[PDB]
Each structure stands twice: as structure tokens, then as C-alpha cells.
Amino acid sequence: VTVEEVRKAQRASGPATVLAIGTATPANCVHQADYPDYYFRVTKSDHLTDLKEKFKRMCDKSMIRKRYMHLTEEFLAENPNMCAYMAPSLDARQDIVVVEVPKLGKAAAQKALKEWGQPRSRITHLVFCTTSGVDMPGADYQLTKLLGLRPSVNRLMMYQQGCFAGGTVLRVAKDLAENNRGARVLVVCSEITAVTFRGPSESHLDSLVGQALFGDGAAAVIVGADPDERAERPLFQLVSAAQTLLPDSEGAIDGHLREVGLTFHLLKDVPGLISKNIERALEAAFAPLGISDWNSIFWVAHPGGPAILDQVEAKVSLDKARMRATRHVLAEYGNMSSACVLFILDEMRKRSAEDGCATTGEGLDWGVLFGFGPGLTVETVVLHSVPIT
Amino acid sequence: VTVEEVRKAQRASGPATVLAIGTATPANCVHQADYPDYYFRVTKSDHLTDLKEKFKRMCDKSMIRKRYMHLTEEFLAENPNMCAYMAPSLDARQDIVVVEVPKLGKAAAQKALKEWGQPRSRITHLVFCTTSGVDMPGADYQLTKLLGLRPSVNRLMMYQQGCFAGGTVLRVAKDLAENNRGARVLVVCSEITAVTFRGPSESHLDSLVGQALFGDGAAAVIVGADPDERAERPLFQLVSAAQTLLPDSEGAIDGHLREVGLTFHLLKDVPGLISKNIERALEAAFAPLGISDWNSIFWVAHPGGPAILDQVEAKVSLDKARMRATRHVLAEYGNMSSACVLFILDEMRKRSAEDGCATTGEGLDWGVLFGFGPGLTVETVVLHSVPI
Ligand SMILES: CC(C)(COP(=O)(O)OP(=O)(O)OC[C@H]1O[C@@H](n2cnc3c(N)ncnc32)[C@H](O)[C@@H]1OP(=O)(O)O)[C@@H](O)C(=O)NCCC(=O)NCCS
Ligand SMILES: O=C1C[C@@H](c2ccc(O)cc2)Oc2cc(O)cc(O)c21
Ligand SMILES: O=C1C[C@@H](c2ccc(O)cc2)Oc2cc(O)cc(O)c21
């Protein structure tokens, strides 16, 4: 009868908890050892032998062993506008991603739901995040139909976000789960590089870097507060989430949706900008918790490129073991934009079980998740591990 | 310190409350009575006389007296591909809205921030919503710079949502404010029709209807729980928020971002689907609260078109006064997509104050806000007014 009464009956008690993770990728695998030859072949750029030597360096130094890509040679050969550096092609790219992004996210969400063990109808919110394609109704609507979620699911469609949004979706799901008693949030990031694939331009080497780094993939997490201990198995606790813009980082990471598709700009200051600011972000997150030793917490960081992990490592004097879960996902999947950190969370807890650690976070109790992206924005999520019996 | 201690010392206690509302439009104004001549002239389509008759009737029946459009005749004369029905023009349209959408948002945000009267640094969250254009970094980042908000403001960027997103942003802001002690959420919906404006085609009358209804505008709202009694002024309380998809509505409203810009497609009698279904949403939102008389609550409904309001009003036998503020915004502003319900909320609390109503909701205590859009999606936000 009163709003205060509704607010007490509404709202949950405990902190947002990750209850399941699942991941999926296209079946087409592309090995980095073959990509320089493959890429310069299908883009009819073999005559640019000087540029091809540069690409061989980037692919050799990428610390990427393989990527999964929906795009095939057979398809590209039928789509020369997408193989040119810059040709009319947004319509052709949209036709792929508008169908394939929700399709890939469905593959990931099914695995998360399966491990969750609860009926799909219990899912109350859906947070769908992509950086490839836009459409009305959005990919959130398509996924809802594909999975058969209830029609009254509360959907949040995060479009054209960039690579920091892996942390964004957890910050979003945290407030949804925590403010709504019983809420169970399905979170899906799904990325498909058909929107960004393009040929090589000697005058835009930062775009060439994108071609050596970005890959396809989707990851799904189910987040909820007040877990049913009898039926749900917690993995991580979401303690706090923050976003920030880095000083003097204007223009560091740009991306425009145009008739030639999604373009990509990237300054060489990106590794320096992140490494030089990461400690301010760590202090902001962990000082109120009383934590100052960055080697005593587990680490999840978006692997924008190997140079970012190298310079964050050196700047903060991390032990090589702390970036292992991050470097493994980079090596085995490449840069999947917003889905990366969720993949790393999945790899963190799996290895923690296989190795016999005390917790899902490599035996450590507290952890941090970092997303980096256009802004330059940095998303920081404090995590807490769960004991492994 | 445990994670439990954090949660307790992290959350707010009270309900999310609307503390300030500001609106803004482009200055360039077009009266509907003049638009068929203007629209057919600038699109070089005066020779399709039968189509023009159809478009007059579209405009006559729209119940819109005027709309604001950033696009001017001088600009359009230099952009023939945007005046054609179907010509490559995404790049030009993007070039417009990527700059003008946050600019119009700051005009409304500055009004709301002035009414709120608190320092801009106190803003902790920003929810920016637009259906006109996309970009990385987004319009939320542009607005942060233009307003001098703190670099650490938590931004949510809602792109390509559609007309129902005026309710979506309140549903987002509700959980941000309520779950974070001290959080003050700036909510900005900004819409500019340069992405959908296109010439007429005789085989695409659904697109032509959009040319009759859609206008430009931006609206800003500041949301927080636990208001300061001396320094802040509650206008409305967000009680609950829900989203649903209507049965048998597949494909009723589709919109595709293509190389010719944002196209618009209708397929399944939108006024019938909303009114056939509105009572279910009312009962879902208000049966837990013991209300069943849909005339006992104030109404804010997204004015997608007059037919939606007519059939919904007739389905639940609404007194003509319940739809008044909604129809006034439709008449003086057109269909401004996500921003419409925020304009109506402002009109309602102002008109309730101009006249001597007891509450900000036209003298009533409880209220309902509806967003309608692609899905068919219905957003339902239960409101509670504030005594004047
Ligand atoms: C690209 C990268 C993998 C190359 O590995 P490396 O061992 O550092 O080798 P280099 O530093 O010499 O870079 C290789 C070449 O690409 C170029 N390169 C690296 N970053 C570049 C950038 N933003 N723009 C243009 N060229 C770049 C270098 O100039 C170099 O060309 P060169 O042989 O003529 O000197 C590494 O620099 C890296 O990880 N950069 C981070 C990229 C990034 O910001 N990712 C975030 C994506 S949002
Ligand atoms: O090249 C390396 C680095 C190595 C490593 C990681 C962390 C650490 O602390 C020490 C060594 O792990 C790996 C594990 C692999 O399966 C394959 C590899 O190629 C590598
Ligand atoms: O640091 C590396 C190197 C990486 C790698 C191997 C081969 C290759 O061709 C490219 C990258 O594999 C890894 C695999 C891991 O599980 C953990 C790691 O730390 C690493």
C-alpha cells in the first residue's frame, strides 16, 4: 500500500554471484601461422610484399595461436567489397552479423544454462552485448526467441560498445541482480569480426593490427544474488564495479560505423596509457578493501594486445603466473572484444579446479577484472572467489 | 572486510525518485499544415500527386500541429541522396547525428542540471539513449566531455533501442540509483530524425507514415534514491518497471541500419496489438498493489501515433483527461521516439503545478508510464506522484 513497502518486498539481500559460464565460437578455425599468407591472399594483396612482411611480424608477435572466424574463403571470394580496404559493404556485413551474432550467443547461453541446471523460464533479465551489427528489434530480442525465454524477460541491449563492455555487462548485471529479489540475469557477449574485416592499407597500419588480433566468439554468464545453496553452485562474487576515462586518452581507440563497415583507429599510446594508469584504478578499487599487494589477487584483464599485458605486468611488477589465464585465452581465441574477460573467467575457474586450488580464483580470495576500450575507458570489477572443496 | 559488509555499506535505502526534468528541441520548426508541400518540394516529388494526397491525409490525421527538425531545406539541397527515398547516405547521416545527438542532449541535460541545482560532480551515473546513429566512443562519452562530468561517471550507452526506450531508461536508472548509496543518475534521451528522413515511394506507405510522425527532441531526467530534504525536490517515484513482448507481434515494427540509413517497416496493426494487450500489462503491474480502476491513476503513454492512443483509451474506457498531457506533447512535438514519455512527464508535473492539482500526477497518487516499440515491446513503469 506504500512505496516503502514495495521497496522492502522488492530488492535482494546478498551480493551478485556468477552462477555459471559458457562459451562458444564459430567452427571455422584459422591458425595464426597461416593468417599472413591467407589474409594477403584473399584480399588480393600479395603484390604488397613490404606490407606483408609487416603483417608477418604483427601476427608472429601477437601471442595468438589461433582464432575462430565465421568468414570463410568461399564466402569472401564471393564478396570482394568486403576484401577491399574500403568499399561499399555495410549492408553485406549487416546481413551476416544481424543473424549470426544472436546465433553464436545462443550457443554460449545454452552451455551456461545447462551448467546452471535451472529452467530457462527462471531467467528474469537478459543483458546482450555486441560490437558487431545493430538492428531493431535487437539481438536481445532474437536471442529471447531462440532460447524460448519468457516474453516478460527484462532485456538490456548493449550495442556498439567496444572492448570494455565485458566489464560493463557485469556492472549492469550486478545492479539488476542485487536490486531485485529472485532476479536471475542471463548475460551474453557475442562478437563476430565480419563487420571489421577489410583489406590492407599502408597508410592505416593501426587497422592492419586489427586484422591480426580480432576474432569471433561469444560467452554467457548467469548472475544472481542470494543463491540457492541446495541447487545453485556459486563461482565468483561481484563486489564492486566502476568505469573511468583515462587522462589524455582522447582518440586513443576509435571506431565508426560507415558504408565501408566498422572502421578501427588505435594510437600507439594505448599500452602506455593503460599501464601508466592501472595503479590508480587498482588503488581506487582495493584501497577501501585494505589491499595493496597486487600479487595477492587473481587477475582478469581484457587482452587488447600482448603489449598491454606486457606493460601492465612490468609497471605493477606482477608475477608471470597472474596473467596466465588471460594469456591463454589470447593464445587460444585471439581478441574477441567484449567477450574476452568472460572467457578468461571461464578459464580461471576451470584451471583452478584441475590444478586443485583452494578457490575458483587460483587459490586467492580477492580478484580484479579489467575491460579496456574506446574512450579510453577502463572498467574495473572487484571479484571474490568461491572455495573449492 | 567481507563482501557482506560491503553490500550493506553500498546500497541505497529508498525508492528511485525523479528530481529534475529538462527538455530541448532543435530550433528549426515545421508546422504539419505546411509539411506536405515542404516535404514533397524538397524531395523533388511534386509530380506524384496521388501520393501527396495520401501524405496530406496522413498528416491531417496525425494529430500533430508541429515538429522540430535539425534538418533544414538549405542543408537538404546540398544532400540529394538524403532526399531520395533509397540512396547511399549513411555516411552523411552519421556525420550529422554523431555530433548533434549529444549536442541536443546537453541542451536538455543543462536545463535539468540547473533545476536540480546540485554541482555536476555529484552526478555518479549517466544513461544515454538514442536511436539516431552509433559511434565509438559513444554519445555518452561525448556528453560527459561536453558537460564536464567526472571522468569516473558510470556510463551506460543505449544505442538503436526504439520508441519504447523512454521506459527502458527509467528501468535502468531505477536499479542504478536504488542499489548504490548516494548515486545520482543523469538520464538523457536524444533523438534526431536525420537517420530516417527520406523521400517518398508509392510502394512503401509505411515508410511515408514515419515521415508524418517523427520529430526531433531530447529530454533529461536526474534520478536518485534518498533525496536530501532541504536541497532536492521529488517529482515522481519509480515504483516498478517491467518489459514484455506482445504475442503475435513478430515483425510489427522493424528497423534496419543500412547504407541508405535507417529504414522503417510496419506489418501487423500496431494499435490493435497494444490495445488488445494493454489490460494484461495494467493488471500485471497494479494487481499486486490492489488497483484495478485504470481511471484512478495518471497516464503517461508513448504517443507512437494517434491510433494507438485512441484504441487504448477506448479499450479501457479512459476519461479524456487521462490522455491529455500525452496528446499535448504529440501535438506540439510529434513522435520524438524514446524522449516522448519524458516530455510528457515534464508536461504533467508542470501542468499539475500551473493548475492547482494536489499532486504532480494531476492530483492522483499512482500512475503508469508506457513505452511501445519494436518487438512488439511494451515497457511498463509504475509511478507514484508527489504532493504539491
Ligand atoms: C601490435 C603488436 C602485437 C606488435 O608486436 P611488437 O613485438 O610490439 O612489435 P612492434 O612494436 O615493432 O609493432 C609491429 C609493427 O606494427 C606497428 N604497430 C604496432 N602498433 C601499431 C599501431 N597502433 N598503429 C600502427 N602500427 C602499429 C609498428 O609500427 C610495427 O611496424 P614496423 O615493423 O614498421 O616498426 C604489439 O605492438 C601490441 O600488442 N600493440 C597493442 C595493440 C593495441 O593497442 N591493442 C588494443 C586493441 S583495442
Ligand atoms: O609460452 C608459454 C608461457 C608459459 C608460462 C605462463 C605463465 C608463467 O608464469 C610461466 C610460463 O605458459 C605456456 C603454456 C602453454 O600451454 C603454452 C605456452 O606457449 C606457454
Ligand atoms: O604465454 C603464453 C604463450 C601462448 C602462445 C603459444 C603459442 C603460440 O603460437 C602463441 C601463443 O600460449 C600460452 C598458453 C597458456 O595457457 C598460457 C600462456 O601464458 C601462454
Numbering used by the authors:
A (entry chain A): 8 to 396
B (entry chain B): 8 to 395
According to the publication:
Chalcone synthase (CHS) and chalcone isomerase (CHI) catalyze the first two committed steps of the flavonoid pathway that plays a pivotal role in the growth and reproduction of land plants, including UV protection, pigmentation, symbiotic nitrogen fixation, and pathogen resistance. The production of these value-added products also offers the prospect of increasing the value of the crop, especially because many of these compounds are soluble and readily extracted. Through crystal structure, molecular docking, mutagenesis, kinetic analyses, ITC, and FRET analysis, our study provides evidence supporting a revised catalytic reaction mechanism for monocot CHS and CHI and identified an intermolecular interaction of CHS with both CHI and CHIL in a non-competitive manner.
The crystal lattice packing indicated that four molecules in the triclinic unit cell were composed of two closely associated homodimers. The two PvCHS subunits in each dimer established a dimer interface with 32 hydrogen bonds and 17 salt bridges, suggesting that PvCHS likely exists as a homodimer in a cellular environment. The electron density corresponding to an extended CoA molecule along a continuous tunnel piercing deeply into the PvCHS molecule was visible from an early refinement stage in only the A and C subunits. At the equivalent regions of the dimeric partners, the B and D subunits, the same tunnels were visible with only crystallographic waters near the active site. The overall structure of apo-form PvCHS was not altered significantly upon binding CoA molecules. The only noticeable difference between apo-form (B and D subunits) and CoA binary complex (A and C subunits) PvCHS was the conformation of a short loop, 271FHLLKD276 near the adenosyl and thiol groups of the bound CoA molecule, which appeared to stabilize the bent CoA confirmation described below. Especially, as observed in CHSs of euphyllophytes, the sidechain of Cys-170 displayed extra electron density and was fit with cysteine sulfinic acid, which indicates its enhanced nucleophilicity and susceptibility to oxidation.
